[PDB]
Design a protein around this ligand. Structure first.
Ligand SMILES: CSCC[C@H](N)CC(=O)O
Ligand SMILES: [Zn+2]
Length: 544
């Protein structure tokens, strides 16, 4: 009965989707698919984060408009996410008319309410190109060790950190000109004005314990005002009444969550739902799935902006850790920096969805893709536990019983054990204790294969007059498979489609209470094949 708006963090428009993005979007998608299975109204929303100086400069280097460039990357991203069956209700852009109007509205409300401050700052400026330089577009000689060709605020030889104004003989990365210090008036959002509100939210108990603990560090350091403006030239939204000024991307980017939802409503011809979800009196739930590096922005700056502009705030933040491969940060030289597009040339989407789901929890711990373990676990759990219940039993049913399952359950007590687990498994999906859910499902799968082993259908099948026993055993196994595939339906969308085709039925959460009796199933060829380390080695080689 709930109305839920769920988001993922927005991929940056100038980089391909990699396995780190996929952890976040798979985690959210599993949760979203479970919520849909329980009958709720869910809106799963994302977008490309498409503004800013790096995007402007990259387009210039490519010789195309930024609009053309971001359109091409948005299509690439959406192709990759479609390949992993991420079931968005809408995927939009921060570069949209909906986000322009909402960004202008929110800024005007913040300004009218006293939360925008004007301050003159000094920043390095490229006088040949004619633009202010972000830190990483300044290079020069390290003031400490004198190593040349160092970028931004740190030296990769001696490890020193410093202001780029301390670089010796600085050069613009854009033009090679010597940058100079130049003043500019900037507009600042007065985040400190919201400190008491944000502190109350932190101790409310909604957020993850590890997130709340980190927020206390940030309050202890002290909240600062945040610069929300940038000078022309820029790729973004111009600030009303401030010629030559633009909104900085991190003002307009989360407003893109709202813009993407407004776009969805407008395309549907739905004139009520936007206010029902975003007005202060909303009874709908709003959840953001994010990574560790987005927490400050989503837990402090974003709720403050919404409060200051008379909109509702997030119901919760769901934070995950970073992805590692073979225990370490992804490494280009080792071939463990793996693109989502590359993954799908070697493996299916379900394999990675399963593996991530089996490792995920409600905490913010990093998630390790160990590639040797990936092969072992997919084969052990998917092929040999779950799919085995269908593959070892379906042939007898199709060949000796015309595809018809028995008229009664052979072991009603065992079946009840399986359906009784629905409450704990569903609660584990609901609470994002994904590893717990998978452990419970696989424990059931072990019981199911123990039942079939005990009944020994490969023996019964050869013994005169035991046709009825064989049909009973094999039908029981298939009904246990039906239940397990229901519990795994949020996890494995394509395997589930193949299972529903075999079973001649849609899998619903409540449907497990009625087993398939006197029921025709269809033949299938391999529901799920084994993988091997040769394929892993090819993936790694292709990623170098
Ligand atoms: C509103 S969520 C925005 C997330 C950023 N695009 C993450 C990044 O670019 O590193
Ligand atoms: Zn140095």
């Amino acid at each position: 009965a709930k109305k839920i708006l769920v988001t993922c963090a927005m991929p940056y428009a100038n980089g391909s989707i990699h396995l780190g993005h996929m952890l976040e979007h798979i985690q959210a998608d599993v949760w979203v698919r479970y919520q849909r299975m329980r009958g709720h109204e869910v809106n799963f929303i994302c977008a490309d984060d498409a503004h800013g100086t790096p995007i402007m400069l990259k387009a210039q280097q490519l010789g195309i408009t930024p609009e053309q460039m971001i359109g091409e990357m948005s299509q690439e991203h959406q192709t990759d996410f479609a390949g992993f069956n991420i079931s968005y209700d809408n995927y939009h852009s921060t570069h949209s008319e909906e986000n322009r109007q909402l960004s202008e509205l929110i800024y005007s409300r913040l300004k009218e309410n006293g939360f925008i401050k004007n301050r003159t700052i000094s920043q390095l400026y490229d006088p040949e190109k004619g633009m202010f330089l972000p830190d990483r577009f300044v290079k020069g000689t390290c003031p400490k060790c004198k190593s040349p060709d160092q970028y931004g605020d740190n030296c990769e030889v001696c490890g020193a950190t410093y202001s780029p104004t301390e670089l010796i003989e600085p050069k613009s990365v854009v033009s090679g000109a010597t940058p100079v210090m130049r003043d500019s008036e900037h507009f600042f959002f007065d985040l400190p004005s919201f400190s008491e509100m944000l502190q109350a939210w932190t101790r409310s108990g909604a957020l993850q314990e590890q997130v709340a603990n980190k927020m206390q560090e940030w309050f202890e350091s002290g909240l600062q005002q945040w610069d929300i403006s940038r000078d022309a030239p820029y790729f973004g939204f111009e600030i009303p009444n401030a010629p030559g000024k633009y909104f900085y991307v991190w003002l307009d980017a989360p407003i893109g969550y709202m813009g993407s939802f407004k776009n969805l409503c407008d395309k549907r011809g739905d004139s009520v739902s936007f206010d029902e979800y975003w007005k202060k009196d909303s009874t709908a739930e709003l959840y953001h799935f994010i990574g560790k590096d987005c927490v400050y922005f989503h837990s402090l700056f974003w709720p403050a902006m919404l409060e200051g502009s008379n909109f509702r705030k997030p119901s919760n933040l769901f934070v995950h850790g970073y992805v590692t491969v073979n225990g370490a940060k992804m490494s280009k030289s080792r071939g463990t920096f793996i693109k989502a597009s590359t993954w799908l040339n070697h493996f299916d989407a379900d394999s990675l969805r399963y593996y991530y789901t089996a490792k995920l929890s409600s905490r913010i711990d990093d998630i390790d893709l160990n590639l040797e373990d990936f092969v072992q676990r997919v084969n052990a759990d998917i092929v040999n536990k779950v799919v085995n219940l269908a593959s070892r039993n379906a042939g007898f049913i199709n060949k000796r019983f015309d595809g018809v399952l028995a008229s009664e359950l052979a072991d009603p007590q065992l079946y009840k054990t399986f359906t009784d687990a629905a409450e704990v498994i569903g609660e584990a999906w609901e609470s994002r204790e994904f590893g717990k859910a998978v452990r419970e499902i696989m424990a059931l799968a072990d019981l199911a294969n123990r039942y079939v082993d005990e009944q020994a259908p490969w023996v019964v099948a050869k013994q005169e007059g035991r046709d009825a026993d064989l049909q009973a055993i094999c039908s029981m196994g298939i009904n246990l498979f039906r239940v397990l595939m229901t519990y795994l339906k949020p996890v494995l969308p394509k395997l589930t489609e193949r299972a529903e085709a075999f079973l001649n039925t849609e899998l619903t959460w409540d449907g497990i209470q009625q087993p398939l009796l006197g029921h025709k199933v269809n033949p299938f060829k391999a529901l799920y094949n084994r993988i091997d380390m040769r394929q892993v080695e090819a993936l790694v080689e292709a990623s170098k």
